[PDB]
Amino acid sequence: NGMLYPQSNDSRIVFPLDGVWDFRTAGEDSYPAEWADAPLPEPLPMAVPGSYNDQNDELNLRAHYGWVVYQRSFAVPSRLVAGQRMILRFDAATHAADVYLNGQLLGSHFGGFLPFEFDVTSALHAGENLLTVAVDNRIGSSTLPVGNDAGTAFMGSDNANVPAVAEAKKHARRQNLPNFDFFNFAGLNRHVELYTTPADAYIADIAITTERLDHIAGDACTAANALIAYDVTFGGDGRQVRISILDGEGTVVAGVTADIERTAKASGEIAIRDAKLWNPGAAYLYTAVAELLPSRIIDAYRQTFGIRTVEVSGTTFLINGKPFYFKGFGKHEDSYFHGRGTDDVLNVKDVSLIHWLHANSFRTSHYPYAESMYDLCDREGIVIIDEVPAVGMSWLQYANPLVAERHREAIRGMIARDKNHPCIVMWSIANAPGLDGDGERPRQAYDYFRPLYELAHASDPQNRPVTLVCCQNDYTTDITERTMDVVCINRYYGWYNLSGDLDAACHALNIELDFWENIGKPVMFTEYGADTIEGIHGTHGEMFSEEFQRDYYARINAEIDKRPWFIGEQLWNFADFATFQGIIRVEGNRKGILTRDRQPKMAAHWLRERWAGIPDYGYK
Amino acid sequence: NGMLYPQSNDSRIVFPLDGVWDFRTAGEDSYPAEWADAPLPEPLPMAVPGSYNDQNDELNLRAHYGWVVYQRSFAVPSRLVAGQRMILRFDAATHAADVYLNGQLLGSHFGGFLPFEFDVTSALHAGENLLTVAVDNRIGSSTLPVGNDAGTAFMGSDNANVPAVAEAKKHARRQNLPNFDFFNFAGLNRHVELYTTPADAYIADIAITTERLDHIAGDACTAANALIAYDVTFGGRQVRISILDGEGTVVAGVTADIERTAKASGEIAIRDAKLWNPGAAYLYTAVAELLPEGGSSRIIDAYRQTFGIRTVEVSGTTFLINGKPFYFKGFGKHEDSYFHGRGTDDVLNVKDVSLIHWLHANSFRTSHYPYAESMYDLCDREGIVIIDEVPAVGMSWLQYANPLVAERHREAIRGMIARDKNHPCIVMWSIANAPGLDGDGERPRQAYDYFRPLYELAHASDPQNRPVTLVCCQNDYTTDITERTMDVVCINRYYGWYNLSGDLDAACHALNIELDFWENIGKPVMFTEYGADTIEGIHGTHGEMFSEEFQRDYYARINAEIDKRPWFIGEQLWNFADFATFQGIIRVEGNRKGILTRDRQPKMAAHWLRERWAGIPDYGYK
Numbered sequence A: 001n002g003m004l005y006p007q008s009n010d011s012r013i014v015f016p017l018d019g020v021w022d023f024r025t026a027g028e029d030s031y032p033a034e035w036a037d038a039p040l041p042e043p044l045p046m047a048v049p050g051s052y053n054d055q056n057d058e059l060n061l062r063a064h065y066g067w068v069v070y071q072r073s074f075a076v077p078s079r080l081v082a083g084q085r086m087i088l089r090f091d092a093a094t095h096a097a098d099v100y101l102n103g104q105l106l107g108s109h110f111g112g113f114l115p116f117e118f119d120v121t122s123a124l125h126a127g128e129n130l131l132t133v134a135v136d137n138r139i140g141s142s143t144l145p146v147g148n149d150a151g152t153a154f155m156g157s158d159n160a161n162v163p164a165v166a167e168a169k170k171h172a173r174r175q176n177l178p179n180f181d182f183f184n185f186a187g188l189n190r191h192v193e194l195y196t197t198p199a200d201a202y203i204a205d206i207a208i209t210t211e212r213l214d215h216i217a218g219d220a221c222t223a224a225n226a227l228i229a230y231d232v233t234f235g236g237d238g239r240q241v242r243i244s245i246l247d248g249e250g251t252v253v254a255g256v257t258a259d260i261e262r263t264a265k266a267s268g269e270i271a272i273r274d275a276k277l278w279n280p281g282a283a284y285l286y287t288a289v290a291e292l293l294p295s296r297i298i299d300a301y302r303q304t305f306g307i308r309t310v311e312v313s314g315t316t317f318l319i320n321g322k323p324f325y326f327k328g329f330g331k332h333e334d335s336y337f338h339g340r341g342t343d344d345v346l347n348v349k350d351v352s353l354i355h356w357l358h359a360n361s362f363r364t365s366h367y368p369y370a371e372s373m374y375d376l377c378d379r380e381g382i383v384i385i386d387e388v389p390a391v392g393m394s395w396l397q398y399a400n401p402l403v404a405e406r407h408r409e410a411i412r413g414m415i416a417r418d419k420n421h422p423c424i425v426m427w428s429i430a431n432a433p434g435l436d437g438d439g440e441r442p443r444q445a446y447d448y449f450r451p452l453y454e455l456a457h458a459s460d461p462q463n464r465p466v467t468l469v470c471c472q473n474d475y476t477t478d479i480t481e482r483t484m485d486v487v488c489i490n491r492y493y494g495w496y497n498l499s500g501d502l503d504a505a506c507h508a509l510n511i512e513l514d515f516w517e518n519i520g521k522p523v524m525f526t527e528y529g530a531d532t533i534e535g536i537h538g539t540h541g542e543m544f545s546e547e548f549q550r551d552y553y554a555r556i557n558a559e560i561d562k563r564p565w566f567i568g569e570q571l572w573n574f575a576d577f578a579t580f581q582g583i584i585r586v587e588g589n590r591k592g593i594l595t596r597d598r599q600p601k602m603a604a605h606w607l608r609e610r611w612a613g614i615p616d617y618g619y620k
Numbered sequence B: 001n002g003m004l005y006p007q008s009n010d011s012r013i014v015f016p017l018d019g020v021w022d023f024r025t026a027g028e029d030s031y032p033a034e035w036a037d038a039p040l041p042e043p044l045p046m047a048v049p050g051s052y053n054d055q056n057d058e059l060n061l062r063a064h065y066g067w068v069v070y071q072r073s074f075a076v077p078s079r080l081v082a083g084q085r086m087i088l089r090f091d092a093a094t095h096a097a098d099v100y101l102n103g104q105l106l107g108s109h110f111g112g113f114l115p116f117e118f119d120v121t122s123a124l125h126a127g128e129n130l131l132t133v134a135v136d137n138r139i140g141s142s143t144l145p146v147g148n149d150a151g152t153a154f155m156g157s158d159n160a161n162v163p164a165v166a167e168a169k170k171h172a173r174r175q176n177l178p179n180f181d182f183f184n185f186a187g188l189n190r191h192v193e194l195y196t197t198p199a200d201a202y203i204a205d206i207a208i209t210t211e212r213l214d215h216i217a218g219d220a221c222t223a224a225n226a227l228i229a230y231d232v233t234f235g236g237r238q239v240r241i242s243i244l245d246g247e248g249t250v251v252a253g254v255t256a257d258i259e260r261t262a263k264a265s266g267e268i269a270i271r272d273a274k275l276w277n278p279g280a281a282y283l284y285t286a287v288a289e290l291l292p293e294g295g296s297s298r299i300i301d302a303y304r305q306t307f308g309i310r311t312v313e314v315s316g317t318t319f320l321i322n323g324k325p326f327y328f329k330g331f332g333k334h335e336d337s338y339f340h341g342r343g344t345d346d347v348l349n350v351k352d353v354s355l356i357h358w359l360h361a362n363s364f365r366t367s368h369y370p371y372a373e374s375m376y377d378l379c380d381r382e383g384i385v386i387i388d389e390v391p392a393v394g395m396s397w398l399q400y401a402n403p404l405v406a407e408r409h410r411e412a413i414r415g416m417i418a419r420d421k422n423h424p425c426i427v428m429w430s431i432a433n434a435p436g437l438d439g440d441g442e443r444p445r446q447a448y449d450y451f452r453p454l455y456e457l458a459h460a461s462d463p464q465n466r467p468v469t470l471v472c473c474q475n476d477y478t479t480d481i482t483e484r485t486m487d488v489v490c491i492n493r494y495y496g497w498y499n500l501s502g503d504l505d506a507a508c509h510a511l512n513i514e515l516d517f518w519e520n521i522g523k524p525v526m527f528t529e530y531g532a533d534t535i536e537g538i539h540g541t542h543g544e545m546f547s548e549e550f551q552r553d554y555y556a557r558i559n560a561e562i563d564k565r566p567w568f569i570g571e572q573l574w575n576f577a578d579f580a581t582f583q584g585i586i587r588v589e590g591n592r593k594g595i596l597t598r599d600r601q602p603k604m605a606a607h608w609l610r611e612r613w614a615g616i617p618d619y620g621y622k
C-alpha cells in the first residue's frame, strides 16, 4: 500500500516525464485502442502536468464529455535500467485512466486525486518507448466526487415544468453535471515519472509516528524526551535495515539497526533527547533515513517527519499539549491556465499569503492535494485538514456498495500517502453529505459514515482526529455530525438565508451555537462567506460588495469569540475559483477573500488584522 | 559554442533539478560566500523555474535590489555518473549568477535570458551534493537590458526642479530603474538540469540548413528537390547522419568523416521534400550518431535534431518563404504571467499558441529577450513564425561607447543564434529594440557605427543567413540613418496614442506622411508595435483612450491605411497580452496595450482582429 514519493539517491533514480505531450480528444464512451500502437494522428500539444480544459482556446474543452488520449515517447540509457526494478508513477490522472506502454495495457486506475503506479520492467525496451494514457473525465451517481445523471449541476437554475425545457433536456449534448461547486477539471493534473529501485529487495513503505512526549517545554519548542516509532515495509524476493535520524542541520542524532522479519517488515522505537518539536508557525523537521543493508548500501529512502502530538481533549484541540485555534480557510487547487494542475510557484506563493494573512491552517477542500503542497506546509508550519473527494453525496450513494468501496479506497489511499506529514492534524471523510431529515434517512447516513470514521482511525498510525464536514442542514435531525471527533460546520447565515440581514444572521447563528454548546464537542467553522466582486463598493455594503464581505466576517466572528468551545475559524474561500457555469456563479465562486489572481479584497485586510492578534495557542 | 538542449537516449541522460529550492535574500552589492559551504540558514522556499519576485507576499521582493541565493541538494546513483561527462545546465538565471557545487566556485555568467553550463565531472561526489546559486538582479548603464543609474524608470514622472525632490532622491533606497517598459523579474527563470554525455568523444553542436530548393510546388507544400547541409561539431572517425521524416522513416542518410576543431559537414539531397510553412508545419529529424573505430554496429553517442525545410529571402519589397510572398500577422509578446513572472510555464506556452491560432495570427516577436527554448519547439510544430530578439533594449548613446556593453551585446547575438539556429520557425533576427538612433550632430552616425557591426555579426553567425532587423522606436525617421539599412524595416509607431492623442484622423494623416517616406526608401516595412492601453470593461459609444472601443477603432483605422501600401509586409501589434511593468503614472497595473488581458481573456479589439486576420492569407496578401 506504500506510495513513497519517488527519490533519487545512490540506490535510486527518477526520470520525470513531464513536458509537452501529444493529445487527442476521443469519444463519450470509447477511444481508439489502436492509438496505443503508433504515434497519435494529428496530435495537439498538451502540457503535463495540467488540466487539459484551459489549454486550447480553439476548442471548448470545458464542454468535453468522456475520453481524451495523451501520448509521448521517451528513451533512457540501457545502463540505467540494467538490473533495476522500473516503476511508472502517475501522481494523478483525473478521474480514471487506462495506461499503455509500447502497446501493452499496463492497467487502469479509478480515482482522480491520488497516485498510482505500474511495474514496467518487462514492458520497457531499449530506445524510444511509446507511452499512451487514456483519461476519462466522467462523473455520475457512482463516482467520488459525485455527478448528477440527469437534471442540472449543483446550484443550477431550472424551469422544469415548461414542456419545451423537458423536451430539450432529452436531446441536449451529454455533459458532466457536478453535484459539487467546483469545475470538473480533468487530465494529467499532476506529475508523471519513471523511477527505479533495486529489484532483489527494496524499501516499499515507511511510517514514522510520534508516540509520546516527556516534559514538553512551556513554549512547546522542545521536549526533554520524544519517543518515536518507525515501521518499514520491504518488497522483493537475517537481513537488516539501518535507521538514521537526522536533525534540521543534517546531523545524525540517533541511529539503530533493526531486523527485517517476514509481510517483510522492520519496526521499532527510538528515543530522541531534547527533541525539537513541530508547531504551527514554528516548523522543525527531522529526516528518517532507511538503508537496506547487504560498507555497501543496497537501498535507501529519506523520509521527512516532524515530532508532535495531536489530542482532542474535551472541547480543546491539543497540539503538543497546547490548546490550538484554527485560523484559515478551505482552499482549492485552482488557477488560470493550469486548472486543477499542480503549480509549485503558486503553492509557494499561496503559503506566503497564508503567512501574510497570519492564518495558520487550511483544509484540502475537496480532494487530496498534490504531495508537494504538504511538504511545503511541513517546512512552513501550516496545519492541514486532509479531505477525500467524497463531496456531492446523499442517500442514493449510501445504498450503492460500489460507492462505499470507492470511499474506502479514497480514505485508505489518502492516509497511506499522507500519514508521515506532521502538518496534517485531522482527516475529513466527506464534505456536505446528506445527513438530516425524517424516517430512516438520518440513521442510514450514520450507518454509512460510522464505519468510514472507524476506517480513518484504523488506517492512521498516528490516530489523528477524524471529522466529517457538514453542510448547512437541520442540525436537530442530523445524528452523524455530532459523533465526529471535532465538529466541522459549513454555515452561510446571512448569505444563502436571512440574506443581507446580519442582525438576523447572527441571531440564527447563536441559536445553532446554543445547540452545539450542549453537545459538548469542540466545534469549528470550515466554511462561511459571501460572494464578492472586487471593486464593487457601497457606503452601506450590500451583497457582492467588498464592504458586505468585510462586515459579514466582522459580525459573525464577534459571535463565535463568545464561545470557549468554538476552536477554529476556517472561512470559504482562500481565493476565487472556477465552477460549472450558472446564475449564482459570477465567473466561478467569488467567496474568495483573495481574487483568483491572489489579490486581497477588503475582507482579506480586515481578517489579516484580526488574525495578527490571535495566537496559535491559548486564544481560548 | 554549441548549447544543444539536453536529451535522454541510449548514451545520454538528463536529471532535472527543478522543484522547491531553498532561498535567502542577500545584500545590495554582496552575499555571504560561506553560504555555499553549508545549508542556507533559515531558508525560504522558492520554486524553480520561476521569478522570485512574486513568490513571497510577506516580503516585498519586487523592491529587492542586489543579490539573492538559491540552494538545493541532490543525489544520483554512482553507476550512472561513472565514466561519463557531467554537465550542469542553467537554462536561464536572470541577470547574473555565481554557481557553487559542494563549496567550489564553478564560475559565473552574465546575461539573463540565455543558457550556460559547467562541467561538474570533478566537482560531483557520491551521496548528497550541495548546489548554491547566487543571482544578481541589478541593472544599470552597462547591462543588457539597460537600467538607469539615476533619475526615474523609463516613462516615469518627475518634478526634478523641486529642491525637496532632488534632495530626497540622493537618499532614497537603491532600486533598479529599468530603461525598458517591462518589470525586472529576476531569479532562476528557466529550468536547471544535470546531464551526461560520453566523455572520450561526444557531439557538441549540430547545424542544419536549407541550402537550396528546386521546383517548389505551387502550394509550397513540397519541392522536387531540397538540398540541405549539416555541420556537426564534436568534443573530447565517422558520424552517421540519418534524415527521418514526419513518420520516422529514414528517407536519406550519409556517413561522414570527422576531421580536426573536430567536425563533420556535408550536403544531403531530399527528393520530393515536404516543406515547412506558416500554418502548415512539417518537421524532419536529423539523427547524428558517432560511430566507434572504425568500423561493428554499436553507437558511441547520438543526438536527435529537429529541423524544417524552408527558405527565407528578402527580395525587393517582398519577404519570401519558400519563394512565396509572406505577410506577418501577430504581435510582440512577453514571457509574463501572474505568480511566475518571467518564469517559463509550458501550460501557458501551449495555451498561448492555441490563442495565436484562435486569433488567426501567424507570427510573433520575442520582445525583448530570447524566450524559453521550449516555446520555439512548440512554434516549430505549430507553424508559427518567430522574429528572435536579443535583450538589447533601453540603449542610447551612453551605451555605445561602453566596451562592456558591446561585449555583452555580441555575446547575446552569438548566444541567441547558436542556441536557436536550427528552428525553422525563426525567419528573422532582431539585434535591438527601440535604441536611440536619430538626432543631430554626430549622434546618428555614432548609432550607425555601433549597430552596423552587430548587423554583420548576426549575418556571420547564422548558417541560414536569415534577414536581420533592428526594431525602431517612434523617432525622427529623417535623421535616423540606421533603420533604413536593415534587411526588413521594423517600426514601432504610436500615432494617435503617445502623440495626436485620441485623434484618429490626425494619427492616420501623420502615419501616411511617414509611410510616404518609407515608400521612397524601397525596403519591405512592417509594424512591430502599435496599440493603445485598454482597461477591459471600460466602454463608450464614442470610445476614448483606455476604452475597449478606442482600441478596436485604433486598429480598424490604422490597418486600413497600411492595406493601401503594397510594400508594407506585416502587422505585429503591441501587445498580445497585458504584462507587468515598473510602477508609474502611465501604467495601470502594468502595460495594458494587450489585446488580451493578463489572464488571456479577449478584449473587443481581439475579436475584431480575429475577424480581420481570418480573411488575410499567409501568402499572397500583397
Ligand SMILES: O=C(O)[C@H]1O[C@@H](Oc2cc3ccccc3oc2=O)[C@H](O)[C@@H](O)[C@@H]1O
Residues within 6 Å of the ligand: A180, A181, A182, A366, A431, A432, A470, A471, A472, A490, A491, A492, A496, A497, A527, A572, A589, A591
Ligand atoms: O456555496 C458555496 O460557496 C460552497 O457551498 C458548500 O456547501 C453548502 C451550500 C449551501 C447552499 C445553500 C444553503 C446552505 C449551504 O451550506 C453549505 O455548506 C460547499 O461545501 C462548497 O464546496 C461550496 O463552494
Ligand SMILES: O=C(O)[C@H]1O[C@@H](Oc2cc3ccccc3oc2=O)[C@H](O)[C@@H](O)[C@@H]1O
Residues within 6 Å of the ligand: B180, B181, B182, B368, B433, B434, B472, B473, B474, B492, B493, B494, B498, B529, B574, B591, B593
Ligand atoms: O509604450 C509601449 O507600450 C511600448 O513602447 C515601446 O517603445 C516606444 C515608446 C514610446 C513612448 C513615447 C512615444 C513614442 C514611443 O514609441 C515607441 O516605440 C517599447 O518597445 C515597448 O517595450 C513598450 O512596452
